[model samples]
Target: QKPYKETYGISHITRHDMLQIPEQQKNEKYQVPEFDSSTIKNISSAKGLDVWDSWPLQNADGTVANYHGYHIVFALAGDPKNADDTSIYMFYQKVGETSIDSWKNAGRVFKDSDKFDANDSILKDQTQEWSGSATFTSDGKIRLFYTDFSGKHYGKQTLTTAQVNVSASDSSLNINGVEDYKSIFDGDGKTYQNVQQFIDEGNYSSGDNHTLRAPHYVEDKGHKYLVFEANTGTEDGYQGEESLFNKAYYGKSTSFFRQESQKLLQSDKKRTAELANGALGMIELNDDYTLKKVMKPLIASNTVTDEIERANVFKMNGKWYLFTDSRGSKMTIDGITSNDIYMLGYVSNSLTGPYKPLNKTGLVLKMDLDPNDVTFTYSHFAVPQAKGNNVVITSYMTNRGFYADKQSTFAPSFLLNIKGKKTSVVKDSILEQGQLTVNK
Candidate 1:
């Protein structure tokens, strides 16, 4: 195996890093998040609509963007009637209008047959909209960068973005239309795992699929970029090798401090060589919003896990904090907890990181971890607020938990306090899944 070059590049975490939770912290068990079915609040939409992976429309700098004090949101909506399907839907909350009935649903963002025919698009048509981010740069200009799935065998997923129209005449705040669609970064096999390669190699449907969606937008220092979830290059990074594995943390007695050279010194090469390739990659966009550069990962789950869901980044106190949600089912090491959920964080001096894990083990936050709690919530995003180190954390509740059906809605949001290399869930993302009580 070859070493990755470049200083201050590749924020990586290994099996050893994942299990470094201090014993004292483990003793103080995280509060088990509570759930209340009676208090669930849903968007005013089709009765069967199930929403998850929601995000507040963002400004160029990555703060929650708003217009006239309205928080417009984008979420993946699904019909319970269909077993496997999702579409992007839009809703908004006014300054004080927080209740379900008062909030307005602008309705679905795209039509039946959208710009799917574009050569750059991965699908022949708008097959489905996976999780992505939205932001406004120009007057009434709406841009959506989301996952466009393909029916073709060439690729299973494509990173697609298009211009959405919001007209001055349409006072309803509904999307006017979508135009100027194009593909920015369809994973080239050499750098990113193109879905075709994963599928052809028999990795698809094995529940170990690689990722290429959830593109979060941020503009730093006059340069626009999209940091997204991806897998190691499709090249012989693994070469289709397969083997049974374990979740070993490479834990050993008396030798605890893990240095770069001493890190992951005891992982299964057979499993790690193939299964542990998750990455958080970036793409620089030109002034015209076209692709400029495909930079290396800000963090790679080397010998840790294989999927970094809803990956996002924000600067706090001059330090870039990159956060990602993980699942125990994807860990490449033995003895790690199974079916567990983790929200890991890492800190770096700059955007392209030589990031060290936050709170030593990068266990930033995880609410509602109890196994009996079916129909759980997930997709935690620590939204940076205007004041201090306090931020708002959000996710969806009653999501796809095993043995339970999806009847998901926006989960209760709470406050989080962050410090350099440290975080505290001042207010947990879990609570009674209640109505958005009026500010009045």
Candidate 2:
């Protein structure tokens, strides 16, 4: 722990003036891109719409859809005028290949009143269930994984999956089947007869018996895993050893958030080497879609303010990358805190590894907006393409400011460089214009 803190020059002091000794005097190279309005353009827009975690998909004939093989599954809520009565809806898009403005709104895949909504037995919450991650299974059926928000405010929100079909034109989704929604893995190794019983029992030892959300699926080396974030402690700090592990927020639950901490302490004797308060964890699933192991702390939170979350792990150029959102750390530059509401980039030679920070300041993209700029930008999902000696990449841009409605945009395709498992944004990688040409 001391070595990691020394190597990374990390501290829990949110304010820079509080840094101890010579550590306070050193200037850090914060790697955040300053905004160039002309560099990227918005791809989608509409009132009451928010798109995230966009990925590419193919047609039944194996042809990549428009948008440079980029297809997106996003959440929608209609009738902004009726916010309370609104329910979640699923939507898909044939992302544009020609220009950022060329995206095609394929339309709603599932509505609030759909049969699957009525059939879903895990989450009884009438107004939850969106934030979907979709992929085609071996049999060519689309499998959608989502977070059940019935347990709001860091409660028992569990990860769930279902099977559905999308139309050829990429507009509609057919209600195929809803599997018995269950937690990807129970951290405590206990089982409840139902979702309500699990919540009511509040058994912390039953394996990840806490908030689990933002599941991003990844496949590597013939193995499948669900990578997501779990609350081992409070959002801003670690949990008290004796406290009922977020019982206040979770409501009268006799659960302990000590497993990860104890494991770390037992193995690493550093007193300050506390267990990662919150971390990016993985659950290996068998081909039969059954739990294999609850492998966690893939990227553990090193500090009180450190968050390794909303991660989208993928492979590029034989190297592995973990692209995730980060906050709570303060990187003051030119009188602005750049680390807050930022995108982080980490690379590793192996999928399961000691992923290293790719940039000096550990930030790939930062919100350099005004201090008064209430618009928060975070969840970044990159879509990469191999063409003409470079990996062309574009990512989803999301923001929530004073805007009366929810919406999302896109960053333009820029060149990325990968040299023997190390990846970074190309220096001056912004292209001359926003046009993509693919070969085969």
Candidate 3:
């Protein structure tokens, strides 16, 4: 029998761990490591930060830059210091930047006060804007899709815009005005169609509350798509309880949240589909950037759905890849065993896919930490930073479940060799394989 081709193992050092090195070691001459700490050491206000969703920006010549398109920051000790505060900030670094410590902070781009109205229909009371996706427009502006609470409704889907001016020398990044923040989709149909009407015209039992988040802006084959995560749920997803410090509080059922979010699952001839809980869905946009049609699921919900969230889609070498972070499923790769958190890949020929697992085991990267290591890692996202054959990915490294730490680190950048179906922590070897290229 032919020798089994070795599958590259996926592992990453923490960016926070890299910042612990000496100043000379922290320069552009820095080398990739097998494992290291976090990189977010010098930013004073970002000391308690939890870095999630590290999107890569491109240089004018289309090479990778150090700036993240947008990231969620929490536990601020300054403005927006509500303890439970979460906001979006822009991060950047020079092109040849070697040390992770050389990355600069472009500061907060969009906070609640910057664009959201105090009397707005959805975001009325004190609420945190969290888990957003961003892309650069053809006209040199940053288009941001974000999520925030709608009064009592959670994660009311909204849209916002900003301008990022990267220097020609790639040494400095200046973020300009943030404008045109508004609601794009709604469950109640005041601004957009209600969840029932939005999905199948009430054909199936629909969710009463909805939140759209994790927007991915993509352009493919002359069509533009705004793909995002739609969380639709009924009262079954929540539980009410009174608090001594405040009024009544409620805890939402994530399982039911998964159950209620099937609006994206549309019918197909290949397979009859039902909403699997919440899923990654997309809407067609007109040439003028207007809403063109109803939403459709790229990954339909099923009875045993993988509880997928924070997904990004792209086409490479005539294959469509849907990369998502999922929970509930235990996956093992090689000899490693992991559950609760996984970065999974599904592949199909069409954009609206009957996507299958990229590997025989159906996982791209599994957390090495045990299932009980709940706070070790989460919030995984694959950035559109494709270089040669490698695709860049990032995830959070923290000690808490959700909030509290702004100083929490990020997993070192990892790369995926799409056609080879292999992943690695180091970029040099991964990029050397050089398969069909995918546009960013």
Location of the lowest summed lDDT over 10 successive residues in candidate 1:
242-251
Scored by lDDT, model 2 comes in at 0.44
- What TM-score, to 2 decimals, does candidate 2 have? 0.64
**Which segments of candidate 1 are over 4 A away from where they belong?**
1-9, 22-32, 117-121, 138-140, 151-155, 168-171, 205-208, 234-273, 368-375, 400-406, 427-440
Residue 274 error, candidate 1, Å: 2.9
* Native-referenced Cα lDDT, model 1: 0.65
Which tens-of-lDDT digit does each residue in 307-410 have in candidate 1? 88888887777888898887766675444456566677888888877778887777776553554454466887777765577666678766542333436677
Candidate 3's C-alpha lDDT? 0.43
Runs of candidate 2 exceeding 4 Å displacement: 1-70, 75-96, 113-121, 130-132, 151-154, 169-211, 233-238, 241-276, 329-339, 371-376, 384-398, 404-407, 420-423, 427-440
Clashes of 1: 6
- Residue-level lDDT tens digits of model 3 in 1-440: 21111101111111111112222222221222233333333233344454444454432222332333322121111232343556666665434443445445666665446554423454444266656556556665555556654333333355322343433333455555455555554433322223343344332344222345666667666677766665323211110111100111001233332322222122121111122234465677665455676454565332223145676777655576777765543211112223335566677777766665555334565554443332355666555443455565555544333334433444455565567443443444221101111332
Candidate 1: residue pairs that collide: 246-333, 246-334, 247-333, 247-334, 248-333, 248-334
- The TM-scores of all predictions, comma-separated, are 0.83, 0.64, 0.62
Encode model 2's per-residue lDDT on 316-355: one tens digit a residue: 6666666666553322122323334555566677767666
Maximum-TM-score candidate: 1
